[PDB]
Every structure is written in structure tokens, then in C-alpha cells.
């Protein structure tokens, strides 16, 4: 299929409380495999899947070292960004980063990821050319000039086009067992009666992987856009997902409404009504 290697990085200042909290979480096909948390009892990179215990202590010692170095660097960045925005020393602030590569079947780079946010707002991003940056405001222009003078695009390219791809292929090989598997949803409807003789029809999808899924409610062909209450896909916490979609219908009329469930583990969608 088309597969991704993404690192999600966070630094949060806590001045007067301690030093910043620093985190790196790695994903493969939007599934978490490694985690570093500076607030863990003994902070080191740790396996967060089964198939990563296949790596020896040198992998972990080396990724820890990198995380301990990135940590010190994000502390300086937090102080630098106070200056650029002329913010007081006393408040809590966040830098987040999405760093990653996605390849298709070719096994060559489709899309390079390096995007930053400050206190939850876009700050700077590598463009799709893997050469230029886009700044979200005045402060980010300062970072832009600094990064051009230093040739930071290139050093990041080398990793993105090189080391990122090569560790993606390796991680897929080691983990394909679980990554490219397909747990098909188990789906059912619940009828909860509601004031002024109406009924909530709730279409459940449970125990599915991957997360990607569509739920639809309809009455003879036509898909109910407006009326549909739709929760965010949630993890069961065993690597499978849950979702539900609901509609309000008049009593006596429940039987005319149909739910569809589309997922990669189904050649044709599931169809379900009440009872």
C-alpha cells in the first residue's frame, strides 16, 4: 500500500515548576511504535509495539542520545521564541513538530513532512519542493532567514530522502505482521427512545483496523448529512478502533432507516437496521 514514517514532537515550558517536558512519539501508518517522554521515571526511547523488541540495545542507546540532544535544543528554541514574540519569562509555552516521510509502491519519496507550531498555531513548514520554507508570521521569517543561511533544507532532505525512507522499509518488514493486517468491523444498531416520541438510532462499528472508516444513515437512497451525530474514531486500547453514527427518527418509522459501514476489510459495505 502507501505507507508513512512520522515523528510527533512536543516541548512545553513549565517555568518555576521545573525544566520543559520534551516528548517524541513515532508512528508507522498512523500507528504508535516508539515513545520518549522526559517525565518518565527513567527517560529513554521505549518500544510501544511488539515487533520493535526485535532491535538491540545499540538502537535504543542511539535514539535516546538523539532525544537527549533534541531535548536540550528545544529548550533553547522555547527561549528564542519568547524573544521573537516579546513574551514574559513566566508563562507556559509549547513547540510541536511533525517530522516524516511517505512512500508508495515505488519505495521512493512521495511527500516530505517538517511542520512546526508555537502555542498551537502554524509557525513554519518545509514546502513540497523539499528546498523552501513557508513562514506563518513575522517571527517565523527570522527562523526562515537563519535556516536559509545555514542550508537547513539540505541537511533535512538528506534525512528525508535517505535515512527516513531506509528506516521506513526496515520498520515495515519487522512489523508488517500487525501493520498491513485488517480487522473488519463488527457493527450493530441500538434503539434509545427520546422525548416527544422520537428514537435515536445509533450505528456502532467495533474492533476494526485500520482506523479509516465511513458510517452513513439513509432513507431509500438519500444520505442524511445534516441530522447525523458522529463521534471521533476512538482506540479500544488493544490496537483496534470504535466509532458510532446516530440519527433522530419518528417512532413507528425506525425500520425505513439503513446504516452502511465502509472499511478496507469489506469488499461491500455492511447494511444494518434496528430491532
Amino acid at each position: 500500500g502507501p505507507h508513512s514514517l512520522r515523528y510527533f514532537v512536543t516541548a512545553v515550558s513549565r517555568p518555576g515548576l521545573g525544566e520543559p517536558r520534551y516528548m517524541e512519539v513515532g508512528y508507522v501508518d498512523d500507528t504508535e511504535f516508539v515513545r520518549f517522554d522526559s517525565d518518565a521515571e527513567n527517560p529513554r526511547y521505549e518500544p510501544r509495539a511488539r515487533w520493535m523488541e526485535q532491535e538491540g540495545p545499540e538502537y535504543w542507546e542511539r535514539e535516546t542520545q538523539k532525544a537527549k540532544g533534541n531535548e536540550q535544543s528545544f529548550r533553547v528554541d522555547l527561549r528564542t521564541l519568547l524573544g521573537y514574540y516579546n513574551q514574559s519569562k513566566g508563562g507556559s509555552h509549547t513547540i510541536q513538530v511533525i517530522s516524516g516521510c511517505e512512500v508508495g509502491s515505488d519505495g521512493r519519496l512521495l511527500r516530505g513532512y517538517q511542520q512546526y507550531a508555537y502555542d498551537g498555531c502554524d509557525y513554519i513548514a518545509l514546502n513540497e519542493d523539499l528546498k523552501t520554507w513557508t513562514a506563518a508570521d513575522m517571527a517565523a521569517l527570522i527562523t526562515k532567514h537563519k535556516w536559509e543561511q545555514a542550508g537547513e533544507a539540505e541537511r533535512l532532505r538528506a534525512y528525508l530522502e535517505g535515512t527516513c525512507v531506509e528506516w521506513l522499509r526496515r520498520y515495515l518488514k519487522n512489523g508488517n505482521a500487525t501493520l498491513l493486517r485488517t480487522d473488519s468491523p463488527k457493527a450493530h444498531v441500538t434503539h434509545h427512545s427520546r422525548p416527544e416520541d422520537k428514537v435515536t438510532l445509533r450505528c456502532w462499528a467495533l474492533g476494526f483496523y485500520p482506523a479509516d472508516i465511513t458510517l452513513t444513515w439513509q432513507l431509500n437512497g438519500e444520505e442524511l448529512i445534516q441530522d447525523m451525530e458522529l463521534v471521533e474514531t476512538r482506540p479500544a486500547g488493544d490496537g483496534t478502533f470504535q466509532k458510532w453514527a446516530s440519527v433522530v427518527v419518528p417512532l413507528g418509522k425506525e425500520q425505513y432507516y439503513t446504516c452502511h459501514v465502509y472499511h478496507q476489510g469489506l469488499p461491500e459495505p455492511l447494511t444494518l437496521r434496528w430491532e
Binding site: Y7, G26, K66, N70, F74, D77, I95
Partner: peptide, 9 residues
Amino acid sequence: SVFAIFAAL
């Protein structure tokens, strides 16, 4: 493998 020594802002 994460990128290591992310560039200084």
C-alpha cells in the same frame, strides 16, 4: 529513526 539535532529557531 527521528531527525536528530533539529535546527535552532
